[PDB]
């Protein structure tokens, strides 16, 4: 989505990434409403697409 940048080489990003607790600790509904900012239906499809990507190799 572009809402999480990988830090490197000095451990710095253009925009600061969301806090680990706001990504993982929080509910799927709050994650999507405040952090990811996408619909519920869209993430359900993402989970299925990613599951298949992992299954192959």
């Amino acid at each position: 989505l572009g809402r999480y940048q990988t830090p490197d080489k000095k451990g710095q990003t253009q925009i600061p990434n969301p806090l680990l607790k706001d990504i993982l600790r929080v509910s799927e509904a709050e994650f999507l409403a405040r952090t990811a900012c996408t619909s519920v239906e869209e993430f359900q499809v993402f989970k299925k697409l990613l599951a298949r990507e992992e299954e192959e190799s």
Binding site: G2, E42, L49, R52
Partner: protein, 333 residues
């Protein structure tokens, strides 16, 4: 690297164009795309249609046509199956049917919309100015409306792929003789050769192929060496669209299309080619409204409705149909 330069360029350009809609597009471009199975009418379509329905797929064209008054124009006999909204199932590879020709052609379902929007009528003289590898050429043939179909492409290597598709999908009875003509020449020169000849013209121009440019590293337009070629791309596109319009009969129609989200390659090329013909050749070209067409096909695709000229299908995870810009025109004078 070129894949990262492509995404880097998209982040700069497309975050501005789509705003808060860009993330939903970005994730879709970086995920698996959705395909539609264009049924081959030469291979007994009724059995193929029935076979594809067993997978829970549905002909989106049949769904679209059933639905607004029948004022809008649309190319017929195109049956293209897709899975439901949110379904990520994949079609198995097509196989040769009982007549030795392939049952269906897998493709981006959105690639059928410029062909549909072009509105082929029975007995039309049709031109596909940048035809290779032949996905849209194949669809133009499937309509059964082409009296004559000119398929052109500058690259003789991509024309081999077009010939492979024609041999794989079209019976020799329909390829030869005078119904199909495959040429390999500069499309920009069509104003001089074959001017005012065609009823319908498809100008599916070479562009930055946004989705493909994020997957394939070989022959990537965003490579450092291909900087000039990429920057002069809107010049070429206008030159090809203007040539398409000059080969169109007065009163005839043209569909311009790209597989890019860039406004520089989409609307600005339509706006540019219309000006060039009005000033240099004194030919008037009217952009036709595809709002009814859009509204009817919105059930299957995500459109960026803020489009001034033409229409744009944007990729979304619910319907991951790649960037597809298209604009219908009528040459008046």
């Amino acid at each position: 690297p070129a894949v990262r330069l492509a995404l880097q360029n998209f982040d700069m350009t497309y975050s501005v164009q789509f705003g808060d809609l860009w993330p939903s597009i970005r994730v879709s471009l970086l995920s698996e795309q959705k395909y539609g199975a264009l049924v081959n009418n030469f291979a007994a379509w009724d059995h193929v249609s029935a076979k594809l329905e067993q997978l829970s797929a549905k002909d989106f064209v049949n769904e679209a046509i059933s639905h607004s008054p029948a004022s809008w124009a649309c190319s017929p006999n195109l049956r293209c199956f897709t899975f439901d909204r949110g379904d990520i199932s994949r079609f198995p590879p097509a196989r040769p049917g009982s007549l030795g020709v392939m049952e269906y052609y897998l493709m981006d379902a959105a690639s059928l919309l410029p062909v549909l929007a072009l509105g082929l009528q029975p007995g039309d003289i049709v031109l596909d100015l940048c035809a290779a590898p032949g996905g849209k050429t194949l669809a133009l043939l499937q309509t059964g409306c082409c009296r004559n179909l000119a398929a052109n492409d500058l690259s003789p290597s991509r024309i081999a792929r077009l010939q492979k598709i024609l041999h794989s999908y079209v019976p020799e009875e329909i390829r030869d003789g005078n119904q199909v003509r495959v040429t390999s020449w500069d499309g920009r020169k069509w104003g001089e050769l074959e001017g005012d000849t065609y009823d319908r013209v498809l100008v599916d121009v070479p562009c930055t192929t946004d989705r493909h440019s994020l997957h394939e590293e070989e022959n990537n337009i965003f490579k450092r060496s291909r900087k000039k070629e990429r920057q002069i791309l809107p010049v070429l596109q206008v030159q090809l669209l203007a040539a398409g319009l000059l080969a169109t009969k007065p009163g005839g129609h043209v569909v311009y299309s790209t597989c890019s989200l860039s406004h520089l390659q989409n609307e600005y090329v339509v706006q540019g080619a219309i000006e060039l013909l009005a000033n240099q050749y004194s030919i008037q070209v009217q952009v036709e409204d595809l709002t009814h067409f859009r509204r009817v096909f919105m059930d299957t695709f995500c459109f960026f409705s803020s489009c001034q000229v033409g229409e744009l299908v944007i990729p979304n995870l619910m319907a991951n149909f790649g960037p597809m810009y298209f604009c219908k025109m009528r040459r008046l004078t």
